[PDB]
Amino acid sequence: LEEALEAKEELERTNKMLKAEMEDLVSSKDDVGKNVHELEKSKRTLEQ
Amino acid sequence: LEEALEAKEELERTNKMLKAEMEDLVSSKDDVGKNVHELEKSKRTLEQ
Numbered sequence: 001l002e003e004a005l006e007a008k009e010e011l012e013r014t015n016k017m018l019k020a021e022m023e024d025l026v027s028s029k030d031d032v033g034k035n036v037h038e039l040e041k042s043k044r045t046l047e048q
Numbered sequence: 049l050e051e052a053l054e055a056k057e058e059l060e061r062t063n064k065m066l067k068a069e070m071e072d073l074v075s076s077k078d079d080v081g082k083n084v085h086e087l088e089k090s091k092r093t094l095e096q
Contacts, residue, residue, distance in 0.1 A: 003051035010058035017065035024072035030096050031079050039088035046095035 083089035 037092050
């Protein structure tokens with residue numbers, strides 16, 4: 001039962017780590033693809 | 049034995065999660081410092 005509680009906590013921590021890693025990877029991919037980053041279009045983009 | 053192995057794996061995963069979170073924070077700080085100049089870059093990052 002102690003191992004089951006620890007495994008639940010470990011699954012939670014692994015989910016949090018995977019979420020953080022996915023966010024970091026998305027940010028890195030966005031920074032890479034920002035080679036153009038048309039701010040004129042981005043105005044309408046993140047206004048709509 | 050399985051419980052001890054799972055606890056060790058959970059500790060290693062927590063250490064890896066801490067390291068990955070530190071690395072993600074450092075990468076975000078670097079991207080923000082590169083986006084502070086040309087404020088449109090920081091605006092696009094905030095929009096993303």
